[PDB]
Amino acid sequence: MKVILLEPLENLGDVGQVVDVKPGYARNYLLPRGLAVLATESNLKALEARIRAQAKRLAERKAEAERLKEILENLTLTIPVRAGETKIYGSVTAKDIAEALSRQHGVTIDPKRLALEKPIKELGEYVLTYKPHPEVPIQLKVSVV
Amino acid sequence: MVKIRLARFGSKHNPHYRIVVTDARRKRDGKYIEKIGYYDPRKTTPDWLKVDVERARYWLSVGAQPTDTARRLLRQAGVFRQE
RNA sequence: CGGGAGGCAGCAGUUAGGAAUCUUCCGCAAUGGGCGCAAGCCUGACGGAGCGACGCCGCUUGGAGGAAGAAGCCCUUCGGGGUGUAAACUCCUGAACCCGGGACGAAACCCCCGACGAGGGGACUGACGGUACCGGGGUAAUAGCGCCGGCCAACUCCGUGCCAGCA
Structure with missing residues (x-):
């Protein structure tokens, strides 16, 4: 008896898993407690459709971290303190670093996905990092005036 | 001049004033002349306002401006009302 | 080259000294003040946030089973004794995190009826903040310091030899 899971459990778990059981077990527990559904092709094809969507749809916002790494990873800031x-x-x-950068080039940034604890207060040279998942460290220059 | 207005007490995020008569040049919470009521603007009680209306009448009768936000509350305990 | 300019013991900040004491933050929404018939304008007062175990209070690093008692280390009259139900291992709970929703503090000033009064009705406005808090889901998940001769609660082994050290 082929069925597809939901809540993971013991000796059969991870959602989307397609496994064979004894009909009694299916009919009197899983299906009724809502811990699975029938492995009909009706559903079996709509499961592949849930994956092929979400799976590649999510590698859009991985290729979009790189559509913004390939521009700031190198570009310089220069801050007139x-x-x-x-x-x-x-x-x-960051409320400045994210800000300045936006009006110096046109780029929006989350002041939260940075890499900063204490707010500098010290003239010199730094390059901090950014986020999420695989990352982009942005390059910054302090100054005077 | 001499006035009727609100002086903070309570805690942070726990406003809690006393309705009180005082010189305007005083500091907000300083020494006052006389206490006439209290007021919880969070109404976390059956008593979230009280006023010695008798006295309120006195201070007005001898010249005394209440604040805007104070006046409200003395009206709301019927001090102006004349039958 | 005739003369000019300044007074943080206001808020924040730099420097010097010292054992040592913070953000060049947000808002006038609340209270209070100044001027104005009013709308409203100013308010580093105030209302809030940021930093520091500086203090007080609350909370966690788990709960129930579990050996006539694993190993490791320490004592030993070499039979054993101690750490110790402690651990491993078994169930069960679910800090953090995750997704959703999200305030109280704010009803006046002002507008209409009455008379710009007493009295009645109607509307604008929240910095903290999508933060507290509520609902769903959800991982066993930081411990350190002082002392054990008497005063004073807690003893044994080795090292050391008026040295090194303690007080």
């Missing part, structure tokens, strides 16, 4: 020497008077949070 009013400092004195090595130390700065104010700081430089």
Whole structure:
């Protein structure tokens, strides 16, 4: 008796799994408790259709992390802080780094998917990273004026 | 001039005022002349407002401006009302 | 080259000193203040957020079984004794995270009836914040410091030899 799963369980689990059981088991537990459905081709083909959708649909927003790595991974920022020497008077949070970058080139960024703890407050040279999954570290230059 | 208005008490995120008569030049929560009521603007009780209406009448009778947001509340306990 | 400019013991910040003491943040929505008949304008006061076990309070790193008692290490009268139900292992609960929904604080000023009054009715407005909190799903998931001669609660082995050290 071929059936497709939902909630994973013991000795038969992961959703989409297609497994054979004894009809009694199917008819009096799984199907009624809603822990499976019949392996009809009716459903069996609509399962492949759920995968072929979600699976490749998700590699759109993986190829879209690279459609934005291939542009900022190299490009430089340069930030005009009013400092004195090595130390700065104010700081430089993301609300600026994400911001400046947007109006310096036209690029929107989440100030949250960065890679920053403390807000710099220190003149020099850095390159922090970005997110999600496989990543893009953006390149930034502090300054004076 | 001399006034009727609200002075914070309570805690953070727990507003809790006392209706009170005072010189305007005082600091918000400073020394006041006299207490006449209290008021919980979260109404977390059957008593979320009280007023010695008797007295409220006195201070008005001898010249005293209440705040906008104070006036509301003395009206709402019928101090102005004349039958 | 005749003369000019400045006074953070206001908010935040730099420097110096020192054992040592924070953000160049958000908002006038709430309260309070100034001017204005009013609409409203200003308010680093205030209402909030950020940083620090600095303190007080609450909460977690698991619950129930489980050997006449694994190994490892320590003692030993070499029979054993100790860590110790502790662990392994078995079920059962489900901090974090995940998806959804999401405030109270805000009813006045102002507009209509009455009279711009007493009284009645009607509308705008939330920085914190998609944050608390509610509902569904959901992984066994940080421990360290001080002391064990008497005062003073907790003893045995080795090392050391008025040295090294403790107080």
